[PDB]
Amino acid sequence: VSTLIPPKVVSSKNIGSAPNAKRIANVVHFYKSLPQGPAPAIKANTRLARYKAKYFDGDNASGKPLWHFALGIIAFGYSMEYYFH
Amino acid sequence: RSVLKNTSVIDKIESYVKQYKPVKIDASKQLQVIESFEKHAMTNAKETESLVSKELKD
């Protein structure tokens, strides 16, 4: 007898599976995606964007800024020692 | 018939058979139901086809 009409009806496979949710996510995310992100920090300029760039970038974490930062406070109180003495 | 020697009934049933020879007449009844069915089916078929093709390229 005469075949039923379901095989030629589709209209809820688009909620029917899980990658639909991911699809509607990644059509927004990827379509308006940039090839590369914006920045790993770069502001501190006054001849100190260089200080941050050399020391406090993702390029390295090394003891050089620590030494520098320590020395600033040492220079304050060391001069003040002779202001107190 | 040439087997039967009492033949006056073979001419009878021959004539009865040839009388009622369109024993059952022609039928094509699938021509109103088949076309209507084809419209609903076609509509749905094309809709599904276009939908999934569209999704593929998307």
From Swiss-Prot, chain A:
GO BP: proton motive force-driven ATP synthesis; proton transmembrane transport
Domain of life: Eukaryota
Localization per record: Mitochondrion; Mitochondrion inner membrane
Keyword Mitochondrion annotated: yes
Signal sequence segment: none
Cellular-component GO terms for this entry: mitochondrial inner membrane; mitochondrion; proton-transporting ATP synthase complex
Principal localisation: mitochondrion
Miscellaneous comment: Present with 14600 molecules/cell in log phase SD medium.
Oligomeric form and interacting partners: F-type ATPases have 2 components, CF(1) - the catalytic core - and CF(0) - the membrane proton channel. In yeast, the dimeric form of ATP synthase consists of 17 polypeptides: alpha, beta, gamma, delta, epsilon, 4 (B), 5 (OSCP), 6 (A), 8, 9 (C), d, E (Tim11), f, g, h, i/j and k.
Stated family: Belongs to the ATPase F chain family.
Function: Mitochondrial membrane ATP synthase (F(1)F(0) ATP synthase or Complex V) produces ATP from ADP in the presence of a proton gradient across the membrane which is generated by electron transport complexes of the respiratory chain. F-type ATPases consist of two structural domains, F(1) - containing the extramembraneous catalytic core and F(0) - containing the membrane proton channel, linked together by a central stalk and a peripheral stalk. During catalysis, ATP synthesis in the catalytic domain of F(1) is coupled via a rotary mechanism of the central stalk subunits to proton translocation.
Name of the protein described by the UniProt record: ATP synthase subunit f, mitochondrial
Interval of the full protein contained in this chain: 7 to 91 of 101
Swiss-Prot record, chain B:
Top-level lineage group: Eukaryota
Major location (coarse): mitochondrion
One term of GO molecular function: proton transmembrane transporter activity
Keywords from the UniProt entry: Acetylation, ATP synthesis, CF(0), Hydrogen ion transport, Ion transport, Membrane, Mitochondrion, Mitochondrion inner membrane, Transport
The keyword Transport is assigned to this record: yes
An example Gene Ontology biological process: proton motive force-driven ATP synthesis
Keyword Ion transport: yes
GO cellular component, one term: mitochondrion
Compartments, as annotated in UniProt: Mitochondrion; Mitochondrion inner membrane
Binding partners and assembly: F-type ATPases have 2 components, CF(1) - the catalytic core - and CF(0) - the membrane proton channel. In yeast, the dimeric form of ATP synthase consists of 17 polypeptides: alpha, beta, gamma, delta, epsilon, 4 (B), 5 (OSCP), 6 (A), 8, 9 (C), d, E (Tim11), f, g, h, i/j and k.
Record-stated family: Belongs to the ATPase d subunit family.
Other noteworthy facts: Present with 6820 molecules/cell in log phase SD medium.
Reported function: Mitochondrial membrane ATP synthase (F(1)F(0) ATP synthase or Complex V) produces ATP from ADP in the presence of a proton gradient across the membrane which is generated by electron transport complexes of the respiratory chain. F-type ATPases consist of two structural domains, F(1) - containing the extramembraneous catalytic core, and F(0) - containing the membrane proton channel, linked together by a central stalk and a peripheral stalk. During catalysis, ATP synthesis in the catalytic domain of F(1) is coupled via a rotary mechanism of the central stalk subunits to proton translocation.
Name listed for the protein in its UniProt record: ATP synthase subunit d, mitochondrial
Species for this entry: Saccharomyces cerevisiae (strain ATCC 204508 / S288c)
Covered residues, full protein: 60 to 117 of 174
